[PDB]
Symmetry: D2
Subunit: 248 residues, 4 copies
């Protein structure tokens, strides 16, 4: 029960990290509000949470929409009575390709899904969290655009790096109200988002640990940042990347 | 003549840093293509360059528009024969305020002017630079969102941090073609963009040097990143911030 | 029982962050081996631990001495059967003052205490941890010398930053054998080492130090200990090569 | 004449980056005072400098010795009238190998050469620079221990990272008096210290090292010297407390 008593939003819940996090947080005593575009995946997820003994509510929607973010928090407060924490984990690789071939349409979709989503998440989540008197927001960034670049990925890397800026700003803006704000930066994790999913070997070799994370290991880092154990952690870009940052 | 022979685009040219950079680059032997929204300022700028003995061309436009970026490079190649370097310096504080009061409209304008502009700049500039066989793009970021947060500034901080991600991605993507890509991160500089413009004292105290930069000192750092002296500098987020990053 | 089954060394265990961390680890299930210079302080801590029904062993010595680190690891292995984790936390501000006034003696002593100690810890800790099939080493660095400079603390800042280079090298060297290596970087923490608490201090220092933090308060040592427990925990299985700021937002606050 | 009027100390001046930087600074107008252990190498460099009609003075000594740094500054002030800038560049990979195999002697000697030297440089350089009304100190660090770890180089990585902490502390301490303090962090550079060039090296190392860089090539020493000239130049008047990567994109390349 490392999150006992907490009420959490998890976005990007329908697979890999988000899914493992919603499941873990619920196991550990948090009441979870989940979201993703794929209602069918959400239903398999909320099913699995129920009958593990946990409570979860879902809302299907596009994480780029302002009205989803508002509704999502309204839900948390309706169903469970308030909101303690949010794991803003939605994002996608988006459109990839050599810089000069990319469309501005593709650039804006990627930034909308990965970075505008986080602004809107903050915009609605912060009042409800400030109401319980604290205390946390975590955003899934990436080592990509923070400690490494790759060919073909400029929109994703810019969107992920932007989350670090948003985190530093919010952490200072909300610190006095007792809301911590951190970025979580996975390395290669075993999900459809991973280039691997001879690629597998190449990807594992990127990490000092010489393997790819299970999604549950990234959820555990998200669980830490949402826990009371992280009461003095804010404005941080926590690398849970198996050493990928420091491996060449 | 530290830039002799070079052909440069400078965006955000109509005041402070951009203006000092266009003037400096021209003094130092580069042919300069300048842009900003304010045609009247551009005319005072191109005037001052002429009769210093330098050559400059201008195009007035919104740096968020794809067609400006295309036209701008076409100009450089039309008027001067190609393109060596670009100082992507356009940006603005944009809409400020406590996170939950901000509009998504205001968020998207700020990101458009500060970060989408840079993608579009890259999209058109890289082919013309790859044509001369190299070699540079510099983008004006900020210490804000990289080493510091402030209340009320989340969209600016996210947009500025995003430029660092875009830089790391492009630097790896284009390194093999001989195009260096760097971010330049000013601290407080004496321009209308500076909070100062009892604020003055507070701002100066933010820096280890206990003063605000002249715009010409930031141009000098931009001149270095565009120079042959920076032939082994790429993927770098160069702090020209008077120590603001490390001062508490 | 967050660290049930773990065998941990904790250095700088006689006060502050180190004491809270050795107590916390033991209360959470770990068998703990504790060190500091003050043998009477260690003895009261192990008494408290074994007493609340935990398990601890103590060895007093200078953390800059190679024989002490060797015998620490011998004590964990002997008494408890192995070594899974180390929290290499001992450190001291060392001699402070304007750069041209400092002695090289004072500089070397600061480095030896803060940084040479970490090399010697690693030198003896690594074979024992590797024997178990893997585990972790955590070193207490600081936000000072990583995201901030202050006047008068050049030896301290150098020594703390040096731990981050040691961390990155060892995370790569040891990663394929399952040993994670991280730095933990506290903000202002309410201990004898905090600027505000020195002998010494102007009244206004406490407010100055608190105001350095986005949270606008100085950490209880327990808060830093929970971060160190995170990093030693199985919950940190994919965290290595990191410099984890547990600094209340100090790094980003101006 | 990019440094016309400047009086500069350059350490590690007998080869590599340091030699190219002392030559370059002098060819660009600075009066240069050069040091390394190899007195015959220094003498050929000053001969070349004074000879191309520049001005240089030499003093051979161990960069880990306090008396050497004191006398270096005495030599600049005496011969040239002041001190504006230092390029504290001397460094050595030092003893390398798996962490449990390294001696504490080898560790201390690496640190003394790479990091204690920087403290002693600063201790004597700062009063002389301050006398002039300000200037700069630049220290050659490395991307290793800042954005990368490698196996077998723990002392080197620690010592190089430590320079960044020293930089941040001194930039704050000295900034109000107009002394800028920066670290310069090269990538692979074609000198005797480069992995590929060691005695030693497997054929395939050169390609491995080149491929570490976004530019896909190892730097000529002159390229790193131009970066150091930037940081000593008036063009870097608002650059302090920075760790400038002149590393060909190594930091961001995987
Ligand atoms: N996997 C890695 O190796 C790795 C490395 C670094 C960072 N990350 C980051 O890790 C986070 C979690 O992703 P994962 O690795 O677990 O990949 P994943 O398996 O694809 O999970 C991504 C989640 O984001 C959601 N998403 C995408 N577009 C959305 C939209 N427009 N509206 C609402 N949700 C949307 C998806 O939901 P629907 O498709 O059902 O909407 C899905 O639930 C992401 O932010 C990713 O960028 C992953
Ligand atoms: N000043 C500081 O203290 C400080 C600190 C950190 C970072 N920066 C960054 O430094 C860079 C240069 O700004 P500055 O400090 O020199 O401030 P400034 O005096 O306001 O110059 C900003 C330039 O950006 C242009 N701009 C804004 N919106 C535009 C648009 N929509 N379309 C085309 N151009 C637009 C402006 O041109 P028009 O208005 O004529 O279009 C102006 O030429 C900016 O990216 C800024 O964010 C400044
Ligand atoms: N307090 C803060 O605000 C703050 C901020 C950032 C980083 N840190 C770091 O946090 C870590 C814990 O310090 P703290 O705040 O808990 O202060 P503390 O209360 O003074 O604890 C320091 C501990 O290190 C031990 N130590 C010092 N020199 C030693 C030596 N030569 N040989 C063996 N042990 C030695 C001391 O024990 P004996 O004297 O009994 O040997 C004491 O147990 C240190 O590395 C410190 O630098 C503290
Ligand atoms: N080469 C690279 O790939 C690379 C990468 C990152 C950082 N660096 C750093 O770059 C800086 C310059 O090295 P380099 O590449 O130019 O290699 P280098 O050719 O070996 O030059 C090293 C210089 O430092 C001097 N030195 C070493 N130990 C000394 C001591 N104890 N006392 C006085 N001088 C000493 C050497 O001179 P004597 O032997 O004549 O005294 C030599 O002049 C060093 O700090 C190095 O660590 C190099």
């Amino acid at each position: 029960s490392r999150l006992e008593g907490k009420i959490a939003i998890v976005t990007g819940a329908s697979s890999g990290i988000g899914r493992a996090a919603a499941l873990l947080f619920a196991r550990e005593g948090a009441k979870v509000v989940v979201t993703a575009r794929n209602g069918n995946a959400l239903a398999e997820l909320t099913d699995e949470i129920a009958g593990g003994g946990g409570e979860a509510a879902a809302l299907a929607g596009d994480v780029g929409d302002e009205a989803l973010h508002e509704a999502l928090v309204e839900l948390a407060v309706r169903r469970f009575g308030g909101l303690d924490t949010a794991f803003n984990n939605a994002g996608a690789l988006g459109a990839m390709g050599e810089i000069s071939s990319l469309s501005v349409e593709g650039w804006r979709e990627t930034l909308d899904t990965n970075l505008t989503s986080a602004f809107l998440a903050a915009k609605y989540q912060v009042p409800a969290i400030a109401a319980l008197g604290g205390g946390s927001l975590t955003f899934t960034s990436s080592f990509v655009g923070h400690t490494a670049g790759f060919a073909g990925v400029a929109p994703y890397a810019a969107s992920k790096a932007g989350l670090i800026g948003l985190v530093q700003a919010l952490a200072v803006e909300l610190g006095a109200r007792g809301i911590r704000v951190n970025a979580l930066l996975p390395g290669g994790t075993d999900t459809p988002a991973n280039f691997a999913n001879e690629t597998r070997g190449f990807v594992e070799g990127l990490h000092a640990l010489k393997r790819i994370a299970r999604p549950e290991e990234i959820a555990e880092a998200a669980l830490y940042l949402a826990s009371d154990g992280a009461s003095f952690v804010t404005g941080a870009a926590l690398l849970a990347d198996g050493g990928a940052s420091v491996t060449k």
